[PDB]
């Protein structure tokens, strides 16, 4: 429905365009029109992985775009590639 | 609606045999079990319910020339009538072998699978049948021998003359009467309680088969090589009660329905007819491109189906009427069905009804052979 | 839509303009190798193959062993057996030949008696059988199917085509 | 006796090579052998399998460097 | 130099053929190596990479 | 992948399975008894509209569940609905039978059938926490020995590694499976025949089903997850295989 | 011990310990209860050999659960000292795991002994 | 000749009397399997005659364990004693259709005048009865069958594993 609408829309846009977020991943090709019903939710680790797949608390951010821009290697990659394509545009 | 719903062929029994089915013996007691015997030498005991086998005995070196199924009456013990059935195979290489079959009919038990007993012989055995209720089997070779199950030597000899015998059959009621077909084209009635031949009739052509009828005890039909099935009384053998005429090659086997009113005949031509006892013409003809030289035919035991063993190595079972479905039917539909049958019986002889009821498709070879036979008969008639 | 209107619209056209199912490739196949075909072989028999074998007097099991130098289990479907039975009285010898304790029959669930479609579908679904034939249409379809050995009858004994280890 | 003599000799030669196992001492399994078995009994494959070499090509090089 | 040494050419052609095979169909390699990271390349709903039996 | 990342649930093509989209996709089924993990898997938790209620989800591991592998590789018709009673032969543990319970939902049942005793005990505990599963510790070759407990199931799933797999399935499906009923066999050729190879084993077992009156609808070979496994989806026809 | 249900007879022990010794020489073998459990969880174990006179028996009786859960063959041999000598370490090992590798010289013996164990189960 | 047939149930035993037989030569046919599948065509074949329920859950558990091991129970012996007609112990035995070849001989030993049958036909009849279930009970009271299944399954499994409060 029409609350949390901006941040949910940004995250859906991100998941739709996720093939460009990382130059090592290269998902399969699908179109992925936005579904009819969905429910954003968090992943609960087991107590058996406190070292491996436990994430953190000061990095747990309430939005996938927020934690993406909180990451830093993605940030330098993004500014690098964006400067490249901007110079190519001008 | 009947001509549109006529669907006679229902299935076949597994993969069948290799070299053509020449012996068939149904179980007179139970309903599912029959035995088939190929000319290769292998005999099988089919469960018709699941359309599969129970065992498969490679039995002989030569062809099997007769099969019978039974229960022996041993004096050493009473064998299990219920967990086992018994088969009696009559070979070409002078042997009669009696086999057990383990049968899952009843579950009130839990070895001895095959070849209870063997009877060595002097001449090539050619036909076999078993005197019922007394377990005493007669085998027709070059002279017929009455064997007991518990005696390895043949108990008695029955022989009119020194000519061979092709086939035998006991009668159903008054079970001491035997009848025999011998290859000096002769029908000989034998008797057991006097232990002797009884009466001989010499026909023109050889009678390939005989079958008593189960509801009159002194009528029997003979499948005769001049395209005919002769329905004889016993006591007055100087004539025949009826003739059944509609074949074009040698009739190979005959059988009576256990109701005692219909005769099914399989021929050397690749076709199988059903007659009624009263009419003397074919009620129906069954035929397929895949069946050839139907060498044995056995009407079933509940009088609903017709097993037919051809010589391509397949034992196909058919319906006795091409409409009576196996499902249990409600009272409304059953009344409507009997009503339509009775009404068609009443108006049977109108020309339109007769045309659409008799228009059955026959293969072109049988059609052409029938019309050629009719031309030949008419020419003989005008000369006479 | 008149003819002159059609011509005008064609001229304006020229001037203006100037679930699914993808079957997986079998895990038996290095690019065309079909590495799931190791002896003893399993060979699907066809009607024309049986008849030409009768014509050229080669035995099925032993002539096939002479071809492949390995033990071969020939398999006959119900469609092929029905085609033999419908061919009937002139090919009685071929029927008694195909009815044999070593010819392991394998059933089918088809509405019809098209042996070509039965065999093509079998080979599409499994790719462990080698096909035995002499028919040109079935030959062309199976040659378009990748990685399936074809075994025709010809000359004095059988010939095998798409097997790597013919010798 | 021709079959017995030559077949037993062929079987024991293959068993000594190692291509035919112990429990397959029959002419049918001799019919069912293959090129992968023989190339597995070669020496460079045995050196790579026993682990004196990191790869098959490394095994080849070791053998021919004596 | 691949034309020079013949077995180097077969070696390199074989490893290239291995990469291309893995591109053609999904091959088996190892198993799961750590914890279940998830299907790293994505799940597709409407593909059905299964062999349908026809009649 | 981590224990904090937010993901977007979505309905799969199969009714009762979900996809968790994110940087990498996961397969997910709704948990029935929330708060716990039956074999230590990472569980997604959403919230739904009184204060809202937390609905927990679970993640199928395709390297464990041979049914996950079949969903993830892509099967046309998985015979397990959100309301059907399924039979599960060889339910070694919760690691797949709990997920089949979660996908048949709180209405339908699932008759877990196992033979040995130690996973029998752990299956007893897991099926005491779940309502839908009823556990049977009778041998899977003796349908007449556990015939008092199962009535007219809708589709059977088969993960027995025994070499008499087709016979076991024929017995259980003849006595318990409804007509026109789904069968899902998971064939493992290394346990059927170590001598002859995978495609021969698969074609042989498919023909055994075709003999035992199961029309095989389709077949998949779940490769990148498990070496040398097939799953055959078939339909018990019971009358007129044609 | 009925809890050690599949216990090998004499000839079966001889075959099993010979295969263990060859697998240790090739180093296709993982030794110890924790290392065997880790191989089983990894799913890379061919099969499992356990001791029977381990003091006590439960500390390795935890293994059959995972063993048939992932459907791995397992067997008990009488002497942990014999198992240690066959593994080729100076200490008595109570549980060893032959791992899976098909670029291995002893694949045929491994498959034979695994088949015989599976038949014993 | 399939005169009576037994059926075990989590809430007790049911003994049915067969009225009309499907013919055993066309038992593999489309029409006979479809009239097994349809309910209104089944009651022309099978009507209920007796239905004795178990007393309590512990008696149900013990009787299920005895059926599993293949023996006869006290309640089962009582039901068959009340229901089956005593014919002559040498010829013309009374035909009871059951589902277990292992259960066959114990029934035969306890009643020499009865004859067990577990055919493809008897399995087909028992299959139809199991399919139609509570619709065949004509309003006779039973528990919720599925709740009975769950309870008895858990009890039987806990018995075979020996679960423990420790
Ligand atoms: Zn076919």
From Swiss-Prot, chain A:
Q: Localized where?
A: Nucleus, Nucleolus
Q: How does it assemble?
A: Interacts with FAF1.
Purpose of the protein:
Essential protein involved in pre-rRNA processing and 40S ribosomal subunit assembly. Required for the early cleavage steps of 35S rRNA at the A(0), A(1), and A(2) sites.
UniProt record similarity statement: Belongs to the FCF2 family.
The protein depicted here goes by the name rRNA-processing protein FCF2
Protein species of origin: Saccharomyces cerevisiae (strain ATCC 204508 / S288c)
Query: Which gene holds the coding sequence for this protein?
Result: FCF2
- Tell which residues of the whole protein are contained here: 110 to 199 of 217
Curated annotation (Swiss-Prot), chain B:
Location, primary (coarse class): nucleus
Q: Which residues form a coiled coil?
A: none
Which Gene Ontology cellular component terms are annotated?
90S preribosome; nucleolus; nucleoplasm; small-subunit processome
WD repeat ranges are 16-56, 64-109, 120-157, 160-200, 202-242, 246-285, 289-328
**Molecular function as annotated in GO:** mRNA binding
Q: Could you tell me the keywords of this UniProt record? A: Nucleus, Repeat, Ribonucleoprotein, Ribosome biogenesis, rRNA processing, WD repeat
Q: Where in the cell is it found?
A: Nucleus, Nucleolus
Record's keyword annotation contains Nucleus? yes
Lineage top rank: taxon: Eukaryota
Q: Name one GO biological process term.
A: maturation of SSU-rRNA from tricistronic rRNA transcript (SSU-rRNA, 5.8S rRNA, LSU-rRNA)
- Subunit structure comment from the entry: Interacts with snoRNA U3. Interacts with NOP1 and MPP10. Component of the ribosomal small subunit (SSU) processome composed of at least 40 protein subunits and snoRNA U3.
Give the note.
Present with 6620 molecules/cell in log phase SD medium.
Q: Which family does it belong to?
A: Belongs to the WD repeat DCAF13/WDSOF1 family.
* Function text: Required for ribosomal RNA processing.
**Stated name of the protein:** Protein SOF1
- The gene from which this protein is expressed is SOF1
Q: Which stretch of the intact protein is present?
A: 50 to 441 of 489
Swiss-Prot record, chain E:
Which segments show compositional bias classed as Basic residues?
6-23
Report the superkingdom from the record.
Eukaryota
Protein location: Nucleus, Nucleolus
Q: Where is this region: Disordered?
A: 1-23
**Partners and quaternary state?**
Interacts with snoRNA U3. Interacts with MPP10. Component of the ribosomal small subunit (SSU) processome composed of at least 40 protein subunits and snoRNA U3.
Please, what other remarks does the record include?
A: When overexpressed, has a role in the structure of silenced chromatin. Overproduction causes derepression of gene expression at both HML and HMR, as well as at the rDNA locus and at telomeres.
State what this protein does: Primarily required at the G2/M phase. Essential for viability: involved in nucleolar processing of pre-18S ribosomal RNA as part of the ribosomal small subunit (SSU) processome.
Question: In its UniProt entry, what is this protein called?
Answer: Something about silencing protein 10
Primary gene name: SAS10
Q: Which residues of the full protein are shown?
A: 556 to 610 of 610
From Swiss-Prot, chain H:
UniProt subunit comment: Interacts with NOP1 and NOP58. Component of the ribosomal small subunit (SSU) processome composed of at least 40 protein subunits and snoRNA U3.
Subcellular locations according to the entry: Nucleus, Nucleolus
- Family statement: Belongs to the NOP5/NOP56 family.
Can you name this protein? Answer: Nucleolar protein 56
**Keywords, comma-separated and alphabetical:** Nucleus, Phosphoprotein, Ribonucleoprotein, Ribosome biogenesis
Q: Name one GO molecular function term.
A: mRNA binding
Q: Name one GO cellular component term.
A: nucleus
The primary site where this protein sits is nucleus
Q: Which GO terms describe its biological process?
A: box C/D sno(s)RNA 3'-end processing; maturation of SSU-rRNA; rRNA modification; rRNA processing; snoRNA guided rRNA 2'-O-methylation
* Function description: Required for 60S ribosomal subunit synthesis.
The remark listed among the other comments is: Present with 13500 molecules/cell in log phase SD medium.
Q: Which domain of life is it from?
A: Eukaryota
Gene giving rise to this polypeptide: NOP56
Species whose genome carries this gene: Saccharomyces cerevisiae (strain ATCC 204508 / S288c)
